[PDB]
Amino acid sequence: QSMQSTLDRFIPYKGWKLYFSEVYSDSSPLIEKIQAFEKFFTRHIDLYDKDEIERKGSILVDFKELTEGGEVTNLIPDIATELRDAPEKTLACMGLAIHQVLTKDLERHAAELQAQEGLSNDGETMVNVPHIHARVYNYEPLTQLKNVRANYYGKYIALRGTVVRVSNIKPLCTKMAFLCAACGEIQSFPLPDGKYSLPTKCPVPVCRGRSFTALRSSPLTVTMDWQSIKIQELMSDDQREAGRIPRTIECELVHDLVDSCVPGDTVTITGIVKVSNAEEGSRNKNDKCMFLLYIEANSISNSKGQK
Amino acid sequence: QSMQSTLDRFIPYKGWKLYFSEVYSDSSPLIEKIQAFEKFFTRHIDLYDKDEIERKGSILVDFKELTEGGEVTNLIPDIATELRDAPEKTLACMGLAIHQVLTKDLERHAAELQAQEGLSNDGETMVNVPHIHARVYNYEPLTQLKNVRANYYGKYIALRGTVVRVSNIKPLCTKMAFLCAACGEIQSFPLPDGKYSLPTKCPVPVCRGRSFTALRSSPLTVTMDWQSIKIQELMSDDQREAGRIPRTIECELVHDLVDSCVPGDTVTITGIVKVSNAEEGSRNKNDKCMFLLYIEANSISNSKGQK
Amino acid sequence: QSMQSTLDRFIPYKGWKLYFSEVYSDSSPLIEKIQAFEKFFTRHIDLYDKDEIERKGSILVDFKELTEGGEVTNLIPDIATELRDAPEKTLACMGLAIHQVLTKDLERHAAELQAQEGLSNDGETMVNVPHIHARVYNYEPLTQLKNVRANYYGKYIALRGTVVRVSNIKPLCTKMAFLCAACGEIQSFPLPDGKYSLPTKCPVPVCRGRSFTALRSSPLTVTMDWQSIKIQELMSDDQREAGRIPRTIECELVHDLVDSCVPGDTVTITGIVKVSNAEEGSRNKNDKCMFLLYIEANSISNSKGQK
Amino acid sequence: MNSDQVTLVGQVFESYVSEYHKNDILLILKERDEDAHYPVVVNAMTLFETNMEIGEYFNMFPSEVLTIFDSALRRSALTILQSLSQPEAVSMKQNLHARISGLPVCPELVREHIPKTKDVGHFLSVTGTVIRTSLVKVLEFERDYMCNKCKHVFVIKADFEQYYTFCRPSSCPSLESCDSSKFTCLSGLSSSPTRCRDYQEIKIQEQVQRLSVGSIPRSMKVILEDDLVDSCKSGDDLTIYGIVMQRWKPFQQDVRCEVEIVLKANYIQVNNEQSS
Amino acid sequence: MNSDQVTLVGQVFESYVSEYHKNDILLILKERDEDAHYPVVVNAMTLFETNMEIGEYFNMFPSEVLTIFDSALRRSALTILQSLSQPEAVSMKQNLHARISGLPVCPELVREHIPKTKDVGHFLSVTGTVIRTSLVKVLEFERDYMCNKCKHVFVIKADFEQYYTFCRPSSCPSLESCDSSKFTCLSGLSSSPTRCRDYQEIKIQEQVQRLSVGSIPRSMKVILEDDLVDSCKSGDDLTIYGIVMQRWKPFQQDVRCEVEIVLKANYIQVNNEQSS
Amino acid sequence: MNSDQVTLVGQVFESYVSEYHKNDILLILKERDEDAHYPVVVNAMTLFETNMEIGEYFNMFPSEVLTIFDSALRRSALTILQSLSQPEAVSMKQNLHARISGLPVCPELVREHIPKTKDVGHFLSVTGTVIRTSLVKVLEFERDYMCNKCKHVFVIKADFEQYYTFCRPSSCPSLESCDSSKFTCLSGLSSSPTRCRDYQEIKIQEQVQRLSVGSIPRSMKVILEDDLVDSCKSGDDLTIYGIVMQRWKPFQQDVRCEVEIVLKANYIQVNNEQSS
């Protein structure tokens, strides 16, 4: 196009806006991180099976694998430090990077089939790639549940615990398609932490009208399977302080992660703790703030499952 | 007949306007049917006793006998189809037929009794007719509870069932005395199904005031006792697979019907099926509407086997 | 002139402001009554201890002893009628007379010290004794819990009751510092009752600002310990039928009286009965609010404690 | 209603109550508490016999007749106050009450079972054992309202809404329309026994020995007014003479209207005591 | 779904109906009630053999294809009506629904596990034993909300996606901009039998044998509609042929929004009954 | 609360902490985490002994003195930070907390019974047994409020004694202050770990030995901040030394303020583990 010679060169995803709410910035550290994650992913792609990854919509990656891969370590000196300070940014960077490797792999797929069998199109073929999000498991710190406090909030942490409870899968709308009343264009809006929100301004540049229509029916809306697991630290009675119940921290699963959890089984969940929604401080402005930490699982790793 | 007194007299049924908003017309189909019912009612002098209609505000008609009569058959090729097609309209017209007879009969009786005394005992004669509802029982077409469906709704149905429970009698305001603030005048205002409503404007042409005050103290409000019975299809192994749940349908009972049947006794309940709002989300009717099927029962007859 | 001299000339006591919000006037009869009570107190000064009264913040004065003293009898024929008709005014009056007597005794001691040797005070102690609530014991009329009623409220009465239980002491805001937002001027505002109230009137007469801000942190706010206790009618088989329902009255025990009573110990209570709005009041918020009988014990004498 | 006839009813009542008053009248000066309000019990049958018109009026407008009876009782006390053996001995009570006993029995008048919607708004007699009695409570039976701008004092009795709530008046009493959110009260200004009058709530379960065992047992609220509170004993058969009346919850738009049959008791008599 | 293709798909179905459903058409003539919901059972595999295009189309858009089949059914009924000596004798039902049976097994077409959000909009066959059956309710398929100024909106369908509830719109429903202050729902005051549709939810639960031991079987609500309703009974394993859908709770700003997985069932055939 | 008195008292406090608790300050600095407020223990009786005047100031105005105490530990920590050879080994501490122990015996200074309102606002020693321990919750002790109109960033703490509820201030505290009708605050928009502090509630009641015979034990809320939370165990007796600050729900006009004497837990000792 006029703006960029290659759609990919200017923006890693050709459909950048739908995939990423954030706009591309050359200056921003996140784009460099995406490149490092991508390079690591390209090296690990041969091990990965493309078809399996495409159906899953997610790829499980060990934190140990991430640390071992050279490019990520070179670009950001400590992956772990980066994860605690900006958990969302790093997780998103990882997801875009794997998705980009997959888009490139899809382009490669088209090229190889065209070479193998003569095609009328012979190139010029649209390639369809499902959204892929990186999953991180076996995060190194492995902090205990008792340690978690107000300071711990906002930092990506790994929790060692046994889930005792599971919840029935509930589809959660990661993105809700929104059509402004005065504009033909409809754009999906990411819901922060799967929580309903309305953009003040319409995404389309030509019309900025506030009013929106929620197109749940439309394919543009994205629904991701979501699960909730209550995970409690497990300790020997002698090891634990006597007379105090083991702390239980709510954890959640998304996409392919869901349904890999069975109650009574020890599963390590790695992800970012978040201040609890629907609590009195959150619900009411000018109210006493009472909050609890709920941690998403970037990846699911089950010690019991591995056995 | 511009004057209200003259119009009421000219019209065959004096209190019909209060009972029904709809205005009878020669062109309208309902009126010929009320005439047919009236001829049938007069022929069955034994069936209708004026005191009985006055006391309970109702008459009970065996449907088979009603269909058998030639006059209604002349008016409608099948009386049964019409009852199914327009249960409310046929009921209103049937109710009108008994009511017209009641108004004429009461007035005639008063005139005959007081002719010797004076012109109607030298005083105004007021009918003071009770609200008249036609109750039809022994309905020949019979539908089992499983059969009842959305298509069945809006048509008269006959079912056999056991009443699980009876509600405590609750006053329900059929009419509400309403004083327009500007008018300073209290008018009884019909409340649909004993559900609170506010008049948009004062009925009189001179006053258009929106504000209305509901005066409980004022005599104009009419309160009617309300009872609810739940009816469950009798479970028989021949009729249904053993352990099939009996469908349970609520019955709204008002006026004479209240306390009609002792619970735990199988009865034949004949009524027009109606829909009521079980819930509206959390008081948001426009956003969320939930409707639950229930059958309003015009007449409850003890089951023949039980008898 | 400051007017301090005029204030001293019209009323010897300068503690009147603490005792009552009302600006005092010479015409009012309470000052004449104060002189009479104070004269009796001068006769009883030897019996009384100045230090004890000052630390206690209250004086134990027999109802009988006041009646016997001649000067008080001359001013008012019987103290008891004054006490019931206007319990608060009389209590303040007796306390003020005690304050005047106590201050005068101290002034005399300082004057004597000045005569013996040069004194910085040179007489004029300016003790500024804290408000003393006169506690009158052995009040002749006796009112039982069954006897107590709405008519009784507003009358000082002697009540005998048994404490079912003692609730946790809760601070009651006797006074609240209030700062006019525009003025920046803080006036301690006696809260009329436990319920929060705002004074539109500014402390300064010349500059008036309606807007006022509650200032609990400021020293002007006074919180008085209040003990909520429920006293059942004393139950004796000879006195009343066994198994009779107890009549229980909630009681307020402010100031010195807090915690004087012991649960399960019969205590003779002499106090004003004041009806108290139920906190819940009418469940649906309404102009009307529900009320419950309450008593405040001006004097507590423990029958169990002292036999 | 012109109420000229009801006022005449009060005058007839005064002559009728004169005999009751002397026994009631005696010891009023003797009574220590002038503030205390004392009920005077007048037989309903006795009023009916003294004048058919007063009895019929009581059936037709029980609340109005009772208020007139109370005013007449006050007037009779004034006459008694005028003549006394000793000025100091005489006791004068500002508030006097009319309590009705031995009311005539008619099927509509006395119903063991729950009063119907047709029965509502009419005097009813209920025979039942009280399941539960709430504790003695006080209510602002009369509340003074003074609009600050109007500066005139006007008082309105509370209506029969749930909790016996009252609504603030739109206009000032002295020939003007003035509305104040804050209405000054005599009780607020200084303690007033008159403003606050005790009220009680009890629920009466109708006699279990109905003609039909199948018919549901019914519980009816009974409201005690003034001196009547605390007379009843829980778990005992109670004979209640009262005006059954609508109790109305605040109406909500497009929500089914609900009203309830609640008796306000003119007088309480213990059926269990009559039996024993 | 190209429009010209849609007529062609209907034509293919119509020819297939003539050979396959002569008996079904005879049954349709026998029942005289058009309003009553009625099912014509078509074996999917044979129809798919007749038209390859129809088979592919069904998989991508089952709902659209079912609609085409229904339109073809009406056309087939009129031709049958003409073929019969008496048009009056043969009865044609407006509520005639093609029921898909004998689907060729495909992972998408037949999936044993409880359906997921990814599978929404795709036909699925799941054998289901229902733990809980909700009571029948009737919720209007279409509501006649009318914007008075516009005069163009009638029988607007209730939105299944928003928890099967229509949402009244402040903006005019019709494209023409003629907004009105008053919006009237004809259906709300009186619902036509056609306008309303039966609504039921059954908690289809995964068979224990299919799931791993020690793992809870998943349960999903299944919509039962029209004739199919009440065929299923709790505790009975019946194959459910249906298209997955999503039901959304009303969204609230600044709080999480809940989406619930659901399946609308095109056809119900009980495997337990088939096993006999 | 004289400014000179607090300045003088602060200098003495700094000297006292350096002479006796320098090692404790070093230990508090040493732990790698600096985010939690760190307890620094001081002994009251010795402070009174060293300077008579400062001890009296502490008795007269403990809350202001406590802020000075806190500033003194922080200033002493800064001098210690300059002194320590290795920054890594002894980490800089973001925040510090102050504990006062060993109050000189006085009837007012140590009371077994719950603190009275007369002595509210005064440091005292109480002995209590924990009945209830609330689960740890995240509360932001300091909440950022930003004036949209003046574009100035300031921090306003959630008011203690308002049940920890922050209050919007339309006018900014700073000299460049413009009243803002609408407040846009980044801190309000996003929760921050630094803004939040650990909050727990401890209910402490008198020990059986402690309570007077025949008298019910009285329980007072204890507010634990940061490090104090989780130290306590339910069913474990505690010796609590703290200033008592009455805590109230925000009041409404004509509504009684529910205010309870609450002892801020300035110092926590386990009575059950050690009597002293």
Author numbering:
A (entry chain F), B (entry chain A), C (entry chain C): 63 to 369
D (entry chain E), E (entry chain B), F (entry chain D): 1 to 276
What does the paper say about this structure?
MCM8 and MCM9 form a functional helicase complex (MCM8/9) that plays an essential role in DNA homologous recombination repair for DNA double-strand break. MCM8 and MCM9 proteins are structurally similar, with an MCM domain at the N-terminus (NTD) and an AAA+ ATPase domain at the C-terminus (CTD). The structures reveal that MCM8/9 is arranged into a heterohexamer through a threefold symmetry axis, creating a central channel that accommodates DNA. Multiple characteristic hairpins from the N-terminal oligosaccharide/oligonucleotide (OB) domains of MCM8/9 protrude into the central channel and serve to unwind the duplex DNA.
And the 3.95 Å structure of the hMCM8/9 NTD ring was reconstructed with C1 symmetry, in contrast to the structure of gMCM8/9, which has C3 symmetry. We also found that the structure of the hMCM8/9 NTD ring underwent a large conformational change when compared to the previously described hMCM8/9 NTD. As a result, the two conformations were designated as Conformation I (hMCM8/9 NTD at 6.6 Å) and Conformation II (hMCM8/9 NTD at 3.95 Å). In line with our observation, when superimposed these two conformations of hMCM8/9 NTD, we found that one of the trimer interfaces in Conformation II was expanded by ~5 Å. This expansion further pushed its neighboring MCM8/9 heterodimers to shift to either side. The left dimer translates downward by ~8 Å and tilts by ~6° while the right one shifts by ~7 Å and tilts by ~8°. Interestingly, the ZF of MCM8 shifts by ~3 Å to the left, and the ZF of MCM9 shifts by ~4.5 Å to the right, resulting in an overall expansion of ~6 Å. While in the Conformation II of hMCM8/9 NTD ring, the OB-hps of hMCM8 and hMCM9 lose their C3 symmetry without significant conformational change.
